[PDB]
């Protein structure tokens, strides 16, 4: 019959909205708040959405959530909690090598939990690009680390490329994550060096002043899309880092091509985060600082020291983030994050820009007073 012979199973489907390709080809510098994802078709419940994601070329997680390698975010307690919730944590390196190795050992000696072949909790750690980081690399490797991230603001350098090749020659079994990068040109040199994943973001962090101090960086949404589009051609996953304020930001970063999301301030002031609580203005809060702030390190500061208010425990906050990601996937019409990215690259997923008035209308407005309770 003609109902099938004209075009097999493909209904008319009216054209409305922009594809990611034409949204990010306007040359404008877009942030997460500058656009939205148009709704699709629903034929499943939100509990049937799969959040399985690739951290690297051969490391798979149950959820796309990762903890940032900072001295006010990730130590053994945070790493254990993130591994148990189905994600992972990267331990910071501004301590001594012996201390970081002991923290990794505490994580390895401990339903959706991320584990290895030996049934131990997965753990990651950060290192620098100086010659003394090779002794630190050896201690982290003997402690049983599974994945390592080369931590830098600008990762397209001779020092990082030399470090990547040294690790690949000495430890062929270790997964190496390069970064930070914000352009396809920077991503090419690191993929050719032999990295297993990429870290994306420059100046987008809540405690980062790099864009005002050094005049270098890029808006986070366009950087994630551009780097992910290039890295997809070689099977290399992208970690979206910096600028996440709510679960809607996480859903946007994943829909633009990222495979996992790394967060700082969102996980700051939680029970498992390093440092103790203190009171001010009648409310509880905890310290949060940038690794490039003068406190954390002739010297030019690229970060600030501050505080965020109490958030509870990650064993109660991560399941809320999971439920929000699944509800966002159900609204757009995809049964998994893999399907979301597949329909994004095929042009089936649609987007729309927002003006300043559109953002004002989208947020809470025109009320005398209100309470904003998330869960």
Ligand X SMILES: NC(=O)c1ccc[n+]([C@@H]2O[C@H](COP(=O)([O-])OP(=O)(O)OC[C@H]3O[C@@H](n4cnc5c(N)ncnc54)[C@H](O)[C@@H]3O)[C@@H](O)[C@H]2O)c1
Instruction: Decide which of a second copy, ligand IMP, ligand X, none touches 114; Cβ closer than 5 to 8 Å per partner kind.
Output: none
Q: Is there binding between residue 332 and ligand X (CB under 6 A)?
A: no
Chain centroid offset of residue 247 CA: 12
Whole-angstrom Cα distance, residue 214 to residue 217? Answer: 9
Restricted to residues 67-126, the positions that interact with ligand X (CB under 6 A) are: none
Determine whether the annotation assigns residue 264 to a binding site. yes
Whole-angstrom Cα distance, residue 30 to residue 35? Answer: 8
CB of 112 to a second copy, least distance (A): 16
Pick the binder of a second copy from 109, 165, 170, 327 (CB under 8 A). 327
Using CB under 6 A, which of the segments 82-90, 203-211, 277-285, 345-353 binds ligand X? Answer: 203-211
Catalytic residue among 123, 208, 216, 329: 208
Let me know if 208 is a catalytic residue.
yes
Determine whether the annotation assigns residue 262 to a binding site. no
Q: Which residues contact 1 (CB under 8 A, 6 or more apart)?
A: none
Residues preceding chain discontinuities in the chain with C to N over 2.5 Å: 110, 297
Query: Cα Rg for the chain, rounded, in angstroms?
Result: 21
Nearer to ligand IMP, 187 or 344 (CB): 187
Contact 180, 153 (CB under 8 A): yes
Q: Which residues contact 364 (CB under 8 A, 6 or more apart)?
A: 370, 372
Restricted to residues 167-196, the positions that interact with a second copy (CB under 8 A) are: 181-189
Instruction: Decide which of a second copy, ligand X, ligand IMP, none touches 68; Cβ closer than 5 to 8 Å per partner kind.
Output: ligand IMP
Restricted to residues 27-66, the positions that interact with a second copy (CB under 8 A) are: 27-43, 52-54, 56-58, 60
Whole-angstrom Cα distance, residue 173 to residue 167? Answer: 10
SS3 category, 88 = strand
Q: Which of 45, 77, 116 is nearest to 276 (CA)?
A: 77
Pairing of strands 65-67, 60-61: unpaired
Pick the binder of ligand IMP from 263, 334, 344, 349 (CB under 6 A). 263
Nearer to a second copy, 100 or 153 (CB): 153
Residues placed in the known binding site: 151-153, 201-203, 205-206, 208, 241-243, 264-265, 288-292, 302, 361-363
Task: Catalogue the active-site residues.
Answer: 208
């Amino acid at each position: 019959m003609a109902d099938y012979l004209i075009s097999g199973g493909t209904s008319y489907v009216p054209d409305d909205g922009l594809t990611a390709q034409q949204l990010f080809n306007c040359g404008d510098g877009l942030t997460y708040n500058d656009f939205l994802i148009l709704p699709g078709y629903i034929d499943f419940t939100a509990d049937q959405v799969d959040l399985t994601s690739a951290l690297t070329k051969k490391i798979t997680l149950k959820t796309p959530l990762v903890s940032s390698p900072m001295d006010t975010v990730t130590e053994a307690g945070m790493a254990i909690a993130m591994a148990l919730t189905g994600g992972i944590g990267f331990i910071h390196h501004n301590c001594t090598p012996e201390f970081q190795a002991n923290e990794v050992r505490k994580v390895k000696k401990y339903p959706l939990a991320s584990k290895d072949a030996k049934k131990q909790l997965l753990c990651g750690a950060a290192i620098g690009t100086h010659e003394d980081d090779k002794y630190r690399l050896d201690l982290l490797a003997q402690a049983g680390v599974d994945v390592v991230v080369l931590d830098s603001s600008q990762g397209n350098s001779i020092f990082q490329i030399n470090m990547i090749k040294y690790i690949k020659d000495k430890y062929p079994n270790l997964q190496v994550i390069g970064g930070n990068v914000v352009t396809a040109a920077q991503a090419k040199n690191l993929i050719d060096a032999g990295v297993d994943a990429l870290r994306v973001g420059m100046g987008s962090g809540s405690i980062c002043i790099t864009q005002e101090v050094l005049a270098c960086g890029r808006p986070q949404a366009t950087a994630v899309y551009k780097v992910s589009e290039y890295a997809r051609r070689f099977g290399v996953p992208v970690i979206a880092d910096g600028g996440i304020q709510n679960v809607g930001h996480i859903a946007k970063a994943l829909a633009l091509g990222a495979s996992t999301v790394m967060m700082g301030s969102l996980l700051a002031a939680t029970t498992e985060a390093p440092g103790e609580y203190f009171f001010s203005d009648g409310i509880r809060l905890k310290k949060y600082r940038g690794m490039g702030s003068l406190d954390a390190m002739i010297k030019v500061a690229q970060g600030v020291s501050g505080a965020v208010q109490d958030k509870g425990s990650i064993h109660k906050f991560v399941p809320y983030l999971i439920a929000g990601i699944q509800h966002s996937c159900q609204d757009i019409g995809a049964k998994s994050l893999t399907q979301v990215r597949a329909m994004m690259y095929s042009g089936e997923l649609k987007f729309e820009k927002r003006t300043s008035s559109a953002q004002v209308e989208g947020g809470v407005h025109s009320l005398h007073s209100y309470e904003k309770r998330l869960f």
